[PDB]
Amino acid sequence: TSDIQTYTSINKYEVPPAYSRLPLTSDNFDFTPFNNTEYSGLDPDVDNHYTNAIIQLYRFIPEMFNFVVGCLKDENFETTLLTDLGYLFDMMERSHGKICSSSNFQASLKSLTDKRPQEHLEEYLESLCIESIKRNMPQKFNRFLLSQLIKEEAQTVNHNITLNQCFGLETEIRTECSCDHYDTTVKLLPSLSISGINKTVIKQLGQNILPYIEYAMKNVTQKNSTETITQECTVKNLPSVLSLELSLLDTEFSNIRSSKNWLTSEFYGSIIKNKAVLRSTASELKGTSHIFKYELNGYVAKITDNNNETRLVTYVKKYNPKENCFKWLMFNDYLVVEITEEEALKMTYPWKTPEIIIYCDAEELRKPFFSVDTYSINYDILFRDYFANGIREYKLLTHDEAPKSGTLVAIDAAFVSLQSELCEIDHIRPKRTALARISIIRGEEGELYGVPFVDDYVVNTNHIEDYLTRYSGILPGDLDPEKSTKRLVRRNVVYRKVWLLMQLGCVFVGHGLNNDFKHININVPRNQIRDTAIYFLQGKRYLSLRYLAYVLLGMNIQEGNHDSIEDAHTALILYKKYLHLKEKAIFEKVLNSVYEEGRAHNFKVPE
RNA sequence: UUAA
Numbered sequence: 001t002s003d004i005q006t007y008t009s010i011n012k013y014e015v016p017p018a019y020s021r022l023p024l025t026s027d028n029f030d031f032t033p034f035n036n037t038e039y040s041g042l043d044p045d046v047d048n049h050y051t052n053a054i055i056q057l058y059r060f061i062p063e064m065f066n067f068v069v070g071c072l073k074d075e076n077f078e079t080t081l082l083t084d085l086g087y088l089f090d091m092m093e094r095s096h097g098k099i100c101s102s103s104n105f106q107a108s109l110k111s112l113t114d115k116r117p118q119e120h121l122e123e124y125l126e127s128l129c130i131e132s133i134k135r136n137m138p139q140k141f142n143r144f145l146l147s148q149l150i151k152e153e154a155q156t157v158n159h160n161i162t163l164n165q166c167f168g169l170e171t172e173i174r175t176e177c178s179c180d181h182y183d184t185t186v187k188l189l190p191s192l193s194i195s196g197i198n199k200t201v202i203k204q205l206g207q208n209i210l211p212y213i214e215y216a217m218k219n220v221t222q223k224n225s226t227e228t229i230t231q232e233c234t235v236k237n238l239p240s241v242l243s244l245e246l247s248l249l250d251t252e253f254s255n256i257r258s259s260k261n262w263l264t265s266e267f268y269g270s271i272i273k274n275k276a277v278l279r280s281t282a283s284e285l286k287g288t289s290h291i292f293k294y295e296l297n298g299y300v301a302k303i304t305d306n307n308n309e310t311r312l313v314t315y316v317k318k319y320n321p322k323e324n325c326f327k328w329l330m331f332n333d334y335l336v337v338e339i340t341e342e343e344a345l346k347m348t349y350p351w352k353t354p355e356i357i358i359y360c361d362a363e364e365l366r367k368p369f370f371s372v373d374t375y376s377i378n379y380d381i382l383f384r385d386y387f388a389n390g391i392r393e394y395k396l397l398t399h400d401e402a403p404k405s406g407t408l409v410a411i412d413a414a415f416v417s418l419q420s421e422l423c424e425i426d427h428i429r430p431k432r433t434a435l436a437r438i439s440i441i442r443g444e445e446g447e448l449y450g451v452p453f454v455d456d457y458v459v460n461t462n463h464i465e466d467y468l469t470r471y472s473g474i475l476p477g478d479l480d481p482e483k484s485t486k487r488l489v490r491r492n493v494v495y496r497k498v499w500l501l502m503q504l505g506c507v508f509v510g511h512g513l514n515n516d517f518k519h520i521n522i523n524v525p526r527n528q529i530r531d532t533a534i535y536f537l538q539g540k541r542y543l544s545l546r547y548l549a550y551v552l553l554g555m556n557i558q559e560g561n562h563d564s565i566e567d568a569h570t571a572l573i574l575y576k577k578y579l580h581l582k583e584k585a586i587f588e589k590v591l592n593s594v595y596e597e598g599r600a601h602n603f604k605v606p607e
Numbered sequence: 608u609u610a611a
Contacts, residue, residue, distance in 0.1 A: 414611070415611065417611085468611075511609075512609055512611090513610095515609085515610050515611080516610080519611085533610080537609095540608080541609085542608050542609035542610080544608085545610085562611080603608085
C-alpha cells in the first residue's frame with residue numbers, strides 16, 4: 001500500500017510494486033498516493049488491456065500530440081477515432097494529474113471494428129476477452145491505430161497530411177519473381193515491423209539495437225508461395241518519428257537482455273546507398289548528405305507478473321523549455337511516477353520485454369507541446385443544428401449570447417445500461433454504460449433564464465439491456481431512423497458542445513454533475529462547477545432532488561419519468577436559492593432544517 | 608444515498 005511508487009527492487013527477479021496489478025477502481029477512489037506528477041494517468045476500467053499504454057506513448061510525441069489536439073479547432077465529426085483521440089489528448093493535458101478515462105475513445109474503436117488486409121479489424125475486435133494480452137497484439141494495434149489515423153487524416157477539413165509526413169516510411173517492395181524481371185510496389189507504411197528474423201548478426205559490430213532497425217529497413221528474404229519467390233524491401237525515407245513494432249522470440253528475447261545498454265538513447269544516421277544503417281553518433285558515416293539525429297521519445301514494455309499476469313507500461317521522455325533537460329516518466333495504469341534515465345532504459349529484468357519502441361527527431365522532440373486554445377476554434381454547433389433524425393420546447397442560442405468565461409447555465413444528462421457487473425473472475429468488473437440524453441438550459445439572469453438550448457438524444461446502435469426510465473427519460477426509440485419523437489444526433493457532436501463550454505469557461509450547475517461528466521467522459525475544473533449535491537451536503541446522506549424540490553420550495557418532481565429538461569431546471573433555481581440563503585447569514589440555520597425534519601420523516605414525504 |  002504505502003510504498004507502491006517504488007520502481008526498483010534489489011533482486012533482478014522481483015517485480016517492483018509500481019509494475020503490478022493495481023486494485024480495481026470500479027466510488028471516490030483516491031488517486032493521490034498513486035500519482036504525484038502533473039501528468040494524468042488513465043482509468044483501467046476499459047475493455048482493452050493494451051490500448052491504455054499506447055495512448056500514453058503517443059500523448060508525448062510533440063508532433064503527433066500537437067496535431068491531434070490541433071484538429072479540435074475544426075468540427076471533424078466523421079473522423080471518429082482522431083477527434084475522440086483529440087478530446088482525450090486535450091483532456092489529459094489539462095487535468096494535470098487528475099484521473100482520466102479513455103471510455104469514449106474505446107467506444108469509437110469498437111464502433112469501427114464492428115463495421116466490417118481487412119483482417120486487422122477482426123483481430124483487433126478481441127475487445128471481448130483480453131492471459132490478458134497475447135503476443136504481438138500491441139504491435140498489431142500500434143499499426144492499426146496509426147493506419148486508421150492517417151486514413152482519417154485525409155478526411156479532415158482542409159485535408160492535412162501531417163501524420164504521414166512523420167510516420168511515412170516509403171517502402172520499396174521489389175519482388176524478384178523472375179531473373180532480369182522484377183515487380184516492385186511502393187507502399188507508405190506508418191510503422192516498421194521488426195518481426196520473424198533468421199540467423200542474424202547480433203554479436204559483432206556492437207550488440208546494440210541499431211542493426212535491428214537496419215535489417216528491417218534493408219532486407220530481402222527467400223520464402224514465399226510452389227515458387228519460393230524472393231522479394232526486396234528497402235526504405236528511402238528517414239521520417240520525423242519511427243514507430244518500431246518489436247516482435248521477437250523468447251529465445252532471442254533473453255539474449256538481448258544480457259547485452260548491457262542494448263537500447264540507444266540517441267542515434268544519428270542517413271542513407272548512403274539505397275540501404276540504410278545508422279551509427280551510435282559514433283561518426284561512422286562513409287559519405288554524407290542530409291543528416292538526421294534521433295533521440296528516443298518513449299516506448300511500451302510488457303510486464304510479466306510474479307504471479308504470471310501480464311500488463312503493459314509506458315516509459316516516456318519529456319523536454320523542459322526552461323532548462324535543457326530530459327525528465328523520464330513511467331505509466332502504469334493510474335500509477336505515474338518520475339524515474340531516472342538509467343532505470344528507464346535498463347533491460348536486465350527478465351519480467352520486462354519491449355513491445356513498441358518509438359524514436360523521434362531530436363530538434364522536434366525539444367519542440368514544445370501546444371494547447372488547442374493556442375488556436376481559435378469553430379464554436380458553430382453551439383448556434384447551429386446538426387440532427388441525424390427526422391424530427392422538446394427549447395430555444396437555440398444567438399450570437400449576442402456569446403458564452404464567456406463564467407456563464408452560469410445548468411446541465412443534466414441521462415444514460416442507459418448495456419452490460420452489468422460481469423464480475424467474480426478475479427473478485428472482471430462492471431464495464432459498460434452509455435449516455436442517451438443531455439440538456440443544457442440557460443441560467444444567466446435575464447429574459448432568457450431557465451430556458452433550454454440543447455436537448456439532444458444521442459445515437460446508439462449497440463445492444464441495450466436496461467432502459468429504466470423510472471430514472472432516465474429515454475423513450476425506447478433511441479435508434480437513428482425510428483426517432484422516439486426526439487432529435488437524435490451523434491455522440492461526437494454533443495460532446496463538442498459540452499467540450500466547447502468548459503473550454504471557454506462556462507459554469508455548470510446541477511445535481512451530482514461530476515457523475516454526469518464521468519459518463520459523458522469529460523473533466524471540468526473544480527472551480528467551474530456548482531454542484532447542489534455538494535452545497536446541501538451534511539457530511540454524508542446525499543439528499544434527493546425530488547425531496548428538495550418538495551422540501552425547499554413547492555414543486556413535486558417525483559414519480560414522473562425523470563425528464564432531464566426539468567431536473568436541470570430544478571437544479572438551476574436551487575443554486576439560486578442556495579445563493580439567497582448564503583448572501584443572508586442563514587446558511588446552516590436553514591441547512592439543519594430538513595435533514596433534521598427528514599430523519600423524523602424518513603427522508604421521503606408524500607408525493 | 609445522491610446519481611442514474
